[PDB]
Amino acid sequence: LDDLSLRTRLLNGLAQQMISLANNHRLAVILTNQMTTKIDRNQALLVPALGESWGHAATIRLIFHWDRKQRLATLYKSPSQKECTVLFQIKPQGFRDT
DNA sequence: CCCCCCCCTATCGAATCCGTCTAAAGTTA
Protein backbone atom coordinates (compact mmCIF):
# COMPACT_ATOMS: atom_id res chain seq x y z
CA LEU A 1 0.00 0.00 0.00
CA ASP A 2 2.16 2.83 -1.34
CA ASP A 3 -0.39 5.67 -1.10
CA LEU A 4 -0.39 6.96 2.48
CA SER A 5 -3.32 9.34 1.95
CA LEU A 6 -5.57 6.53 0.71
CA ARG A 7 -4.64 4.43 3.74
CA THR A 8 -5.42 7.35 6.05
CA ARG A 9 -8.83 7.89 4.43
CA LEU A 10 -9.65 4.18 4.63
CA LEU A 11 -8.62 3.99 8.29
CA ASN A 12 -10.66 7.08 9.21
CA GLY A 13 -13.72 5.70 7.44
CA LEU A 14 -13.27 2.33 9.12
CA ALA A 15 -12.99 3.93 12.57
CA GLN A 16 -16.11 6.02 12.00
CA GLN A 17 -18.07 2.99 10.81
CA MET A 18 -16.88 0.89 13.75
CA ILE A 19 -17.82 3.47 16.38
CA SER A 20 -21.19 4.05 14.70
CA LEU A 21 -21.89 0.31 14.70
CA ALA A 22 -20.74 -0.11 18.31
CA ASN A 23 -23.02 2.68 19.52
CA ASN A 24 -26.01 1.65 17.39
CA HIS A 25 -25.98 -2.06 18.25
CA ARG A 26 -24.91 -1.81 21.93
CA LEU A 27 -21.61 -3.59 21.30
CA ALA A 28 -18.13 -3.77 22.79
CA VAL A 29 -15.39 -3.50 20.16
CA ILE A 30 -11.77 -4.63 20.58
CA LEU A 31 -9.08 -3.98 17.97
CA THR A 32 -5.53 -5.32 17.96
CA ASN A 33 -2.53 -3.27 16.82
CA GLN A 34 1.21 -3.81 16.38
CA MET A 35 4.20 -1.90 17.69
CA THR A 36 6.95 -0.22 15.67
CA THR A 37 10.31 1.43 16.29
CA LYS A 38 10.76 5.21 16.34
CA ILE A 39 14.36 6.44 16.22
CA ASP A 40 15.48 9.84 17.50
CA ARG A 41 19.16 10.79 17.74
CA ASN A 42 20.68 7.47 18.82
CA GLN A 43 17.91 5.92 20.96
CA ALA A 44 14.88 3.92 19.84
CA LEU A 45 11.38 3.87 21.32
CA LEU A 46 8.56 1.40 20.69
CA VAL A 47 5.42 3.23 19.54
CA PRO A 48 2.11 1.97 18.08
CA ALA A 49 2.03 1.82 14.30
CA LEU A 50 -0.37 3.23 11.67
CA GLY A 51 0.66 6.87 12.08
CA GLU A 52 -0.36 9.53 14.58
CA SER A 53 -3.93 10.39 13.52
CA TRP A 54 -4.90 6.79 14.32
CA GLY A 55 -4.40 7.64 18.00
CA HIS A 56 -7.61 9.68 18.09
CA ALA A 57 -9.75 6.85 16.70
CA ALA A 58 -9.69 4.48 19.68
CA THR A 59 -11.81 5.48 22.66
CA ILE A 60 -9.63 3.42 25.04
CA ARG A 61 -6.03 2.39 24.39
CA LEU A 62 -4.01 -0.25 26.25
CA ILE A 63 -0.35 -1.21 25.86
CA PHE A 64 1.37 -4.46 26.83
CA HIS A 65 5.14 -4.62 27.24
CA TRP A 66 7.87 -6.69 28.86
CA ASP A 67 9.84 -5.89 32.01
CA ARG A 68 12.39 -8.58 32.94
CA LYS A 69 10.15 -11.71 33.01
CA GLN A 70 7.01 -9.75 33.97
CA ARG A 71 4.12 -8.64 31.76
CA LEU A 72 2.67 -5.17 32.34
CA ALA A 73 -0.63 -3.65 31.22
CA THR A 74 -0.70 0.15 30.92
CA LEU A 75 -3.82 2.26 30.39
CA TYR A 76 -2.54 4.86 27.94
CA LYS A 77 -5.62 6.87 26.94
CA SER A 78 -9.03 6.90 28.63
CA PRO A 79 -11.63 9.62 29.30
CA SER A 80 -12.98 8.01 32.49
CA GLN A 81 -10.10 6.64 34.59
CA LYS A 82 -6.48 7.48 35.38
CA GLU A 83 -3.23 6.03 34.08
CA CYS A 84 -2.26 2.81 35.85
CA THR A 85 0.10 -0.16 35.59
CA VAL A 86 -1.11 -3.74 36.08
CA LEU A 87 0.82 -6.99 36.34
CA PHE A 88 -0.80 -9.91 34.53
CA GLN A 89 0.17 -13.46 33.63
CA ILE A 90 -0.60 -16.13 31.03
CA LYS A 91 -1.26 -19.63 32.38
CA PRO A 92 -2.70 -22.88 31.00
CA GLN A 93 -6.07 -21.73 32.34
CA GLY A 94 -5.63 -18.49 30.40
CA PHE A 95 -5.45 -14.77 31.11
CA ARG A 96 -5.08 -14.46 34.89
CA ASP A 97 -3.67 -12.30 37.69
CA THR A 98 -0.15 -11.87 39.12
C1' DC B 1 -6.01 24.24 -6.77
C1' DC B 2 -7.32 21.23 -2.08
C1' DC B 3 -4.98 17.23 2.61
C1' DC B 4 -2.14 13.82 5.39
C1' DC B 5 2.73 9.48 6.59
C1' DC B 6 8.59 5.51 7.90
C1' DC B 7 12.38 2.98 10.17
C1' DC B 8 17.51 -0.87 13.79
C1' DT B 9 22.62 -2.80 13.75
C1' DA B 10 26.61 -5.00 15.54
C1' DT B 11 31.15 -8.04 19.80
C1' DC B 12 35.62 -6.99 22.26
C1' DG B 13 39.46 -7.88 25.23
C1' DA B 14 43.91 -11.19 29.66
C1' DA B 15 46.19 -10.46 34.47
C1' DT B 16 48.81 -12.19 38.85
C1' DC B 17 53.31 -15.87 42.60
C1' DC B 18 53.65 -17.87 47.61
C1' DG B 19 55.59 -20.41 51.58
C1' DT B 20 60.44 -24.42 55.15
C1' DC B 21 60.87 -28.93 57.79
C1' DT B 22 63.01 -32.74 60.18
C1' DA B 23 68.47 -35.88 64.24
C1' DA B 24 70.96 -40.52 64.32
C1' DA B 25 74.42 -43.84 65.72
C1' DG B 26 79.78 -46.88 70.03
C1' DT B 27 84.61 -48.73 69.51
C1' DT B 28 88.87 -50.88 70.53
C1' DA B 29 93.59 -53.93 75.76
Measured between alpha carbons, how far is A3 from A97 in angstroms, rounded to an integer? 43
If DSSP codes are grouped into helix, strand and coil, which group holds residue A16?
helix
Measured between alpha carbons, how far is A70 from A84 in angstroms, rounded to an integer? 16
Report if CB A36 to strand B is under 7 Å: yes
Sign of the Cα torsion A95, A96, A97, A98 reads negative
Resolution in angstroms comes to 2.6
Report if CB A93 to strand B is under 7 Å: no
Measured CA to C1', the nucleotide nearest A36 is: B7
Amino acid at A53: S
